[model samples]
Target: MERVNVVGAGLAGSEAAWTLLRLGVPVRLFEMRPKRMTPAHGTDRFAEIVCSNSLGGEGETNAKGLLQAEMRRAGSLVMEAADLARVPAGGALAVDREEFSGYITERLTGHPLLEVVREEVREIPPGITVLATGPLTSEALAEALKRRFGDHFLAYYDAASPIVLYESIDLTKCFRAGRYGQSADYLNCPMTEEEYRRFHQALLEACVPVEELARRGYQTLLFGPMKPVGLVDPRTGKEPFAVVQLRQEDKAGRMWSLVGFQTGLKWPEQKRLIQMIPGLENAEIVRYGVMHRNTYLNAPRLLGETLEFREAEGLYAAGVLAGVEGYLESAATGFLAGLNAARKALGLPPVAPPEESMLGGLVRYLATANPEGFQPMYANWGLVPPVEGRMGKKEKRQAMYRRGLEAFSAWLSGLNPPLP
Candidate 1:
């Protein structure tokens, strides 16, 4: 059997290697870490998480959660590592950073069928290669890819929001609400006009250092995270000048995220400004906001529904580079790519999962999204095709969940023996 070449040992790469090895295929996993590191990563670890520790919301019905469930059923290595390093994040899956990466590093390297290569790969392998190098791919490799792939590559910037320990927030000053009294789904901090003015002034003067965003002006934030519409404080029975919302970052809610607060501010500046929020005065930030350049392929025009490159033989793209956002979305593509690549090696036909499934909807969106202004996306209920009848939000959501789970399981079962 031909051995598969897996490039970049991030979450997607590691998962891809695991899938192939589990199916009795040999794999050579390449990683460029201690030898060379990106602006975001710190250590030479497989599957090092660079952004939020939380894996978004949990629950089978939740789009991301449903994706995770499907990956687990398919025997995902990343899911296994996350479970082993589990931390407290209410209604979501979060992991201990060190433990999470360490577990995956150990597992992938320890496997006899998998050969771990600790150097950078500048050229794309000629046959059976899965490129999961992620958004921050090296300049040399990126140039090599662009030379082969042409103008289909798109470059942009992505930011990570700061995370604070839950105990650090002042519960007395902030209340739990999900906007419009929706489920206490988030923690809201209200600010008076005077406070808002002070913060806004500081924010405008704060150092972002990103020329692109700076040129857009800081006032643009008013319509974004700082917007106070729909959220009326119970104490005042009125809306404040602005509101800062924090979301749960784990199953126990120990860590929280500044919702929609991606930024390029310096660490010291972020701390100074975030402290001005009512509930976050003494908040201890575990992770500060960071920004970096991201490159993704316009998948709609360059790749098939199976993630295989249209013009290139034995080549596949996954993770953020494949033009998908969110952690699970990236890993989901890895599984499908690995599965299909293995099938290719075995002389079998490539197949996409059922459209009713979250995985199916995601691939359909990637392959069919409008190319003119195509953008990376995550799994959501709206992406799935509508069910037969009209119904309320909750009922409709449940129906989609049921349909997705049923179809996904059936598709898995129908696959050939090793994959099934």
Candidate 2:
């Protein structure tokens, strides 16, 4: 059997190597740390988590929790390390970061079928390979990829706006309409002159670096996302001073994003500013706006559901570079990519988890989303198809959980040779 080349020993790459090893496939795992370092990472340890320690919420109802459960069922190495290094954090699965990464490092390094290569991989190798360099991929490798896939193949900055739950938005204060008689797709929060001025002032005060706002001038927002042109308030029969548009983010309309509101404001300030909008006063924000340097692929145009490159057979992209956000998401992609890469080596067909599963739903999004304005996404209930029939929120979530887990288990059982 051919030895799979797994690049980068971050969460996804480590998981990929472990999966390949468990399937009796030899792996040469590469790491570019210590010799070369990313801005966010601080260690040479395998699967080093550079940001938050929380793996996200636990239990069947939470999207991430469901993904973790699925990964555990698939014998994920990352989840095993996380479970062993668990720390108390209410409903969230927080861990001792050092212990978690250290555990993964020891296990992968000690694996008989695995070979750890501590050096940068500047070019993608031939044969079966899993590239999981994550969001801070080395410059040389990124350039190599760019040269192969054109300049738009990678996105260097993440300017994600905040996403809020549709149920939490106060609909009475908002009107469902698109600009100038187009499809009524947007939920507009109209603001009077007084409200607009106050909101504008608050935004100016909360702007990161503050000086950027001064140079751009006070009406910056007015000409941007907050512009009320063509959006007439039905109540007053005239366009309001400003409008904040919430675009539906999911097929089920369970989540909405504040269009063009990406920022570097502190979380508390973001929360405060969002609530100041008439319709979002009591909005529950599921994801906050963030502006940061991140490296991710244009997955929709470049990859398939198995995380394999559409044009490059036996070569896969996993982790953040595969256009997924969050730790568990990265590991899940690794698991799928590794499984498929191993299958390719074994002369079998590639398979993905059923679309009903959260893992599968995320992969589906990556393979099917619009490539024009592609962005990395994290696990959320919005990704899954809503359960049929009307029920309470909690009941609906429970039903979906049951459906997804069952589908995932069935898919797992049907895999040839099976997975331990």
Candidate 3:
């Protein structure tokens, strides 16, 4: 009973083909979309949000909202189709890029023993597969997954997000609240003081030059929407100078994102220098935060923390092309690569995520990195696993994101039990 094969449907191949069809195990799920398209997908969708559609926090005691509440209590059919294609990105949980890729193409082409193959596999497939092809992964199956995983493990271009069309906003100088009002569907855009020095000196002198083959910290910008450290501007109640937000980019609200707009610029000079912000003067730039070519793998000498491939197995490598970066660390590496591909298929004995959790500080930072200064990693609390009976670092990242969501919900109630 072992027949699996999943290559790119994005977001770690539709959460590793819904955790290999809920471990009853039988999958095919290959996808290439409208016959190959990825300049940040403009169609043929299936988990496409090359950037902000905010799934960052839901607060359930953070750590990416307890890793999206442990992938919706482990029955995550892509987090229950992102809760019916969500929207209203306040404390963040966004959706609605075509109703979240048309509800993941109508639940994996109407599953009933998974098989949804839309074709475009270019190459590599002969049994036990799960490429989770992300990062525009396609150059003839990324050079046949780099001739069977080699060439320093692999990674390419990184930085992301930029969408819009929420009626091309210009809401008479935007305003709402969620910062120090914390979560009520955030949408603030207050800024004054020569409109923050003319949109921060035109986003730092019209910057736009990242693409050496792309993917390496797309030039810092984050520190926008929210966190003025207890903001308070109730009718001149104080604080009001820098701000620029617009989250809910789909989930039936029809696109709108810019929150910390990651970029490589040059899309008409980022819509005419982000229309020199002030609720973006006469804003109406549906989809423009541009930058492409994101790649990874330098996780200090090629990975571990059971994402193993320190060299081989039947091999393994999860998302953000396995450098353990965001989107709740690629759905916590698709829940530890479906429990280590079901412990290498039933031989069983391995499931470690307790490094004080944020999925064990991203698998202990890809197994104690410094494999000579590895980069591309996220899930804060300074990579936990350091609370030797601690008392600080914000009570140790709110008690390590609440004991790592109670030890990942007791390892998903030990892998099965009314698991939906």
Candidate 4:
């Protein structure tokens, strides 16, 4: 059988290569990191999560959690590393980002069937190939893809939060607790009405476009990231007017990132606005907030349910480049593409996950959505088909979750010569 070419070593690419290797297929994984860096990535590590540390919530009720559960059942390497590098995040699954990337880098690099290549894939490779170059693909390769597909790539802006030194936060001015007192996994910077007003005003005046903020409304921050609903300040014994929460970014708790603070603010403006919050008054920023253009294909016009390019056989797309968003979603697509690519190489028929599963729902959306209005999508209950019958929202969701898992389990078991 011919060797598989897996482009990029980010989450999606890494998972794709892992899947191919797991299927007893030889894989050559390409990574253009240290030699050719992207605006968002900081290191030459495989599966580096460039944004938030939290992989969303846990438990079956959440869409992300259900998707992860499905991935775990499928023996996803990304999920394996996530579980191993898990950090405290209350209800959500957060990981020590460095540890998570290190685990993946070490695991994939050590595989005897895998060859790691540190070079830019300027053009699509021949034979069985999984293009998982992600959102920050180099310009030359992106242009090549445009010419090959004859479809103009769609793009959107995405932002990341800033990380601060935990030691620099004024502990005296903050309280440590998760929402509703679940755990002390978060550092809460409580703000009084006056303080919140000032901070909010400063934020509005900062680099965020004035018209955009107006469209979102004056109280957008209050209701979004700065909402203080479930937390009460121990000192005041009441919920503050608004709050800024910081989550632990590392196992050592040395680095903390502002929760829900993704922004396009200029670095100096970000520093100034962040200091306005109580606990972060003296915060030492480690990574400044960044907003970058995310490029993704119009999947509906270009991809099949198998994530194979509609016009190119034996060529698959994975990750955000495939029109799926977030870490878990990207890895899920990688798993599917790699699985199908390996099957093709093995002279076996390609397969798709059961339609009832979240994975299937995502692929379906990609293949069937309106191309003109298409945007990268993340896992949400909306993508899954609703369970029939009259039931409350919670019960309906539970039913949907049960159905999807059952379908996934049956499909997994039905695969000939089951996945190892």
Candidate 5:
């Protein structure tokens, strides 16, 4: 059989190539790195992580965790590599960046069924192919895309979460627990009403700027990422005015990150304001949050639920470029596209995972969301189908997880060639 042409070698591209290779299809993977570089990338390595190393929450009840579990069931190479390269951060999956990339790079490059092409692809190749070029598409390729698909780009600004060295944080001032007492995976930096007011003012007055944030209002950050919802301070035995949460960034528990703390603050300003939090009084910042622009397609109008092009046969799109957010979400799209592309190449009819599964719901959102007001979407409980019964919040989450697990298993059992 002819090799499937897979473009870009980031998480999405690498995952696509891995999936295709496993299905007994040869893959010619392309990566334009070392030869060309983007503003955010620092290496030529495959699946290099430029942002936070943590993959987010773990287990079925957590949206991100649910997606990862589905990917794992499908024999995900990204998950496998992550497991081997992991550093401890309680219940979450965090990896060593260099080691994580190195592991995947070695595996893909040394694979007998794969060919690594170190060049830029400005145009699409003919016949069945997977386009996993990621968010940072090359100028030539991006222009080629606009001309082919029509200009319907949805753009936004996203920021990274800052990391902290474990030694720098004041352990005595913090307590440990996941929100609602789920698991002790996160460290809580509880603040009183007075403390929150001071920090909120400082954050708003900080010199770093973002027009999108400005248009949304200064209190946007307060209501969104920084809002303290379920966490209860152990010392006070009640919810604090606000809480600064830190998640383990690696398996070793040596590094942690401010959960939902995506900010555009100036580095010095960030450090100054962060120290104001109760538990972060002497915390040393390892990586200050950095902001960058991202571009995604309005997939509801341009693609199918299978992630194939609506107007172009034999063409598939995956990753952030295909209008999804977060690293694992991008990889999940890659998995679907890769599976479908390989099936097409093998003369087998392509299939979508069952809609009851988290993967299926996410795919449905991409293929059918309102194109007029489409924004980049990430995994959340609201995106999936609801389960039976009128239940409380925690019980509702449990039911959803249970239903998803059943759906995922049934779908896997029905795969044409079956997963290995």
Candidate 6:
């Protein structure tokens, strides 16, 4: 049988490799760790999750949940591994990194047809390969990718937010409310314009030279994590001129993200300026965020929806390398890449999900998603295409989630092996 190579044993790679293995196909899994490390990684384990461990929210009816449902229906090796290693993360499917990655390592190693190699693959391989090398592809490999796939100008724009140890946030000063009380997903820190100006000024002046940023993308941080568009100060009834909304990065609610506070400041500077918010004084920053060059292929210009390289044969991409980010979304790509690779290997046909559902829309966007200058996207109800009439916003969101999940489930039941 022709062996397929799945590169980067991270989420998409792990999922891709395992998917092939399950189809009775042989796979060679390539990973780079121990020998070299990315700034964000803490260990050499395959599929080591460096950032937030939460796979995403629950409520199977939601977009993220729908993806989870799809993975489960398909008997996802990655999600199954994650479930076994699941730690206490409230409503989300987070994991104990050591156990979770170890579980994946154990499974792949145990498989007869799968050979897991722990070395950096610096160039595109000669045969069938799935480039799932996530955000931290080794420099040599990253550069080779650049030359072959068209270089995306890189910048170390710190996308880190101040994560306050939940225990440290002054609950008395903040309230558990979604923007305008939409959902109680954030700890709202209220501030008057004067206060915001002071905090913003301090952030600008506080000196931390650790991270470097392109002057252009500096605003990208604010537009992302710093913007106060929907957030309202509970006390005033009216939205504050600006407010700081910290999202719970963990299910324990142990860590809260400084909504749009991605910073270029050093750790010390990050704490100094970010804590200047009303409720954040003396706030403990558990994880100090930093900016790094987020690499992506110019998807529209380079690859098709099948994620096959336009000019390269047997070489394809699935995760962030394909310009898709986030857990569920990338995993969806994994499922597609595996199905596509299996079809190619078996002389069968390949199919991609339609752009109607959230998962499909996310893949379609990556395959055809207008870069819109590529800021990593998180899937939300907003991304789902509307049906027809307007309902209450929450109801509308729920309806969108329901519609997507229904479609995904139907799509799943129709698949050959029925997904898992």
Question: Each candidate: what lDDT?
Answer: 0.78, 0.86, 0.62, 0.82, 0.78, 0.67
Output the number of the lDDT-best candidate: 2
Residues 215-330 of candidate 5: C-alpha lDDT, one tens digit per residue: 45656655654556777777888877777788764334545778767667778977887789787888867556656577567788888889898888778989887877778888
From the highest TM-score down, the ranking of the candidates is 2, 5, 4, 1, 6, 3
Per-residue lDDT of 149-251 in model 6, one digit per residue for the tens? 5565322132555566675677887866674444566677777767755655555456123222223344433454445667666677776666677775432
Against the true structure, what is each candidate's TM-score?
0.70, 0.89, 0.34, 0.70, 0.70, 0.67
Best by TM-score: 2
Model 4 residue 216 lDDT? 67
**Lowest-scoring 10 consecutive residues by lDDT in candidate 2?**
207-216
TM accuracy, model 4: 0.70
Return model 6's CA RMSD, one decimal. Answer: 10.2
Clashes of 3: 23
| lDDT rank order | 2, 4, 1, 5, 6, 3
Q: Could you tell me how far off, in angstroms, the CA of residue 65 lies in candidate 6 after the best superposition?
A: 2.6
Error in Å for residue 272 of model 5: 21
Residue pairs with backbone overlap in model 1: 89-250, 89-251, 89-252, 89-253, 90-250, 90-251, 90-252, 90-253
Model 2, 11-45: lDDT tens digits are: 89999999899889999999988899999999989
Could you tell me the TM-score of candidate 2?
A: 0.89
Instruction: Compose the digit string of candidate 3's lDDT tens values, residues 76-191.
Output: 66677677878887788887767776787677667786887788887867656656666677778777766766665564554434554454467766666667545656566667
> Over 4 Å off in model 6, which ranges?
60-62, 153-291, 416-420
Better of 3 and 5 by TM-score: 5
Higher-ranked by TM-score: 3 or 6: 6
Better of 2 and 6 by TM-score: 2
Q: Model 5 misses residue 281 by how many Å?
A: 30
Stretches > 4 Å off in candidate 3 = 1-121, 124-128, 133-136, 142-174, 177-186, 205-243, 248-257, 264-292, 295-317, 321-335, 340-357, 360-377, 381-393, 396-398, 416-420
All candidates: CA RMSD (Å):
10.5, 3.0, 18.2, 13.3, 11.6, 10.2
